[PDB]
Structure 1
Amino acid sequence: HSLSSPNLSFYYNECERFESFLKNHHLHLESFHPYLEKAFFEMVLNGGKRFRPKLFLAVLCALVGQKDYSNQQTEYFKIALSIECLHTYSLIHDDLPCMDNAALRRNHPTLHAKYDETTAVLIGDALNTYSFELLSNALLESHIIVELIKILSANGGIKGMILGQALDCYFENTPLNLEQLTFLHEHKTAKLISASLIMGLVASGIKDEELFKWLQAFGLKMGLCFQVLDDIIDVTQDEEESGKTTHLDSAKNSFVNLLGLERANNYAQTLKTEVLNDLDALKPAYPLLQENLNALLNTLFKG
């Protein structure tokens, strides 16, 4: 890392510490199944940018004082892991033969390729449910926990992430317009990204309705940008760099298919610019939060 403020340095360190927490997270299963214990958490451990926990932590590390943060660190990490579990579950089900049929994710074989289809369906299911187990076991105030579960379940469920996925699959042959593809991407991807942001504020304990509505809106815009960049990743990166299977392009609905690569790059660059401009509005009122988010987004936007 370069020359960073104490606040930003603290945030970076917590992201590393969360990765250790995730790596040392063991679930003990006693049964006569040969591999279920290992295969359950395998996809979480396999890799990932941890973008959503980083979003969660960016809000949280900036809003609560380091000493007040310290006692509840493990509990905050449980919440961050619950977001990652739900995200990982969606990846597993996304890669299914009946869905996107992918053989590789996070530089490793997919659960249905290594084991079988059934195993992949069921572990996806397990991680879906496990997200809420982790959340309910985090030792924060009860009303905070309830509110966190409300957010994760609304955004990750039928009105959010799943609507996006169902649209993506149903209209895989139908060419959609830009407004429809934007809607799809907002649901498929942006909903969970905005959830991560507002869950941070909720987990902090701080009442701030104005900031809540800001973070939620920011996440939808930035989450759309995230997916547009992901669509570009498919044609610009090989499997060794992306960690995941390159889809056969024209078979599905992406920004690159709709606009062509050159126009999609233009759309993405101007979307990036607006995202970072919106982030400047945080700087007077919430400078510590701006700092964390700006650093996270610069790292993402560099490639």
Structure 2
Amino acid sequence: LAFFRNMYDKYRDAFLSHLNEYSLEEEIKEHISKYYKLLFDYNCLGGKNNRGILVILIYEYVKNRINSSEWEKAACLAWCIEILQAAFLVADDIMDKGEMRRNKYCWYLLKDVETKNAVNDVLLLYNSIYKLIEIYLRNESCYVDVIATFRDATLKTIIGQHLDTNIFSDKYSEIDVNNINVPEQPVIDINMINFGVYKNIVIHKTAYYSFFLPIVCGMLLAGIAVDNLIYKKIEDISMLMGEYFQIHDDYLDIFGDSTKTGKVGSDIQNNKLTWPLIKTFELCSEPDKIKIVKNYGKNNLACVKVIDSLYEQYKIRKHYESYEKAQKAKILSAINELHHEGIEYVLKYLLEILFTGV
């Protein structure tokens, strides 16, 4: 764990090093190294580090101890999930018109960067992962399985980000290849406001890259055979934990303190299908439905305020806290079926520090 924290530089600088081998003029090489050193630092640091720490812990509690060449490979994988997070979050804030990420301006918003650099930079962060895994793990037998898990995790996430972004779109509620002029007015689709659709999305956008991937990396490296039925159990727990983590997130979009969360709430105005939106539709009077249809998805104070107060009226904070309690018990029940005492402690521990880090 202190190996992880202290070895950020190592992996950052191993990748910067690879590009310094490019056939470029020395001045150009210097400019690239400055730009890219910032892109990693700005975008990979400042968070809780829960995914990376998970890789480290799973790895340790699966093995009976671990040399520093072994740690160097696990912390590699751990940082690569933290680079994956970076890439995803850079793109998310473009998609969601983010203002603040980890208490600092979103990367795409910087005048030195903009959306043109940010898009190129997502691709860079994402490909650095695979270069770093080649550097530290090409000779391991889990090597192909590790790179497969990253790419399949990433594909699931890309699908869920697509659904998060289009579930209410006109495309769905034939795509028009002739319209570049007539913008679509954000409206909610009431046929999509149920927990079934919500789960399809949050499992895909959150659960795979955030829980499944880092646990599987820890296990693949520690050497659990890919045909072991523990991986399926692990997948089922990841889905429970993923939906749990994402609901807490949706909850913070309205109830959090932007100085503590490090980001600014935007789901109402960005027309998202969130747990609060679904719970309220489940509970609210028929005229309040007409009221959510009218006011949701509008970057307008009085419109957002209507929604906030319907969430105040329908006691969404209380319904959340009773979801947290019921879902946590559900996760713990599944963890207790794992028949691996090492992984169980880790996942119990994770579940405690999930919202805070540590």
Q: Report if TM-score (shorter chain) is over 0.5.
A: yes
* Counterpart among 214, 219, 232 of residue 213 in structure 1: 232
Alignment of 1:1-303 (within 5 A): 14=1, 16-24=2-10, 25-26=12-13, 27-28=16-17, 29=20, 30-32=29-31, 36-66=35-65, 68-96=66-94, 99-114=95-110, 115-139=113-137, 141-157=139-155, 160-172=156-168, 173-175=187-189, 176=192, 177-192=194-209, 193-207=211-225, 209-249=228-268, 251-260=271-280, 261=316, 262-282=318-338, 285-300=339-354
Contact 1:232–1:265 (8 Å) recurs in 2: no
Distance 1:21 1:130 in 2: 16
Contact 1:195–1:216 (8 Å) recurs in 2: no
Partner SS for 1:247: coil
Q: Per-residue deviation at 1:21?
A: 1.1
User: For structure 1, which segment, 169-178 or 25-34, has the greater mean C-alpha deviation from structure 2 after superposition?
Assistant: 25-34
Distance 1:233 1:103 in 2: 16
Task: Show structure 1 runs of 5+ residues with no match.
Answer: 1-13
Q: Per-residue deviation at 1:245?
A: 1.9
Contact 2:55–2:74 (8 Å) recurs in 1: no
Contact 1:138–1:145 (8 Å) recurs in 2: no
Q: Per-residue deviation at 1:266?
A: 2.7
Structure 2 counterpart of 1:145, one-letter code: Y
Partner SS for 2:352: helix
Q: Per-residue deviation at 1:56?
A: 1.7
Contact 2:48–2:356 (8 Å) recurs in 1: no
Distance 1:206 1:239 in 2: 41
Q: Per-residue deviation at 1:45?
A: 4.1
Contact 1:92–1:110 (8 Å) recurs in 2: yes
User: Which structure is larger by alpha-carbon Rg, 1 or 2?
Assistant: 2
Q: Give CA deviations for 1:188-221 in whole Å, capped at 9, x if unaligned.
A: 0011121211221111123260222221221111
TM-score scaled by structure 1? 0.85
Partner SS for 2:354: helix
Contact 1:164–1:184 (8 Å) recurs in 2: yes
Contact 2:3–2:71 (8 Å) recurs in 1: no
Going from structure 1 to structure 2, the CA distance change for 1:84 and 1:48 (only over 3 Å counts) comes to same
Task: Show structure 2 runs of 5+ residues with no match.
Answer: 21-28, 169-186, 281-315
Q: Give CA deviations for 1:126-155 in whole Å, capped at 9, x if unaligned.
A: 111111111222236443111000111011
Going from structure 1 to structure 2, the CA distance change for 1:185 and 1:93 (only over 3 Å counts) comes to same
Count, aligned residues: 282
Distance 2:212 2:36 in 1: 31
Kindly report the root-mean-square deviation, in angstroms, between the aligned alpha carbons of the 2 structures.
2.1
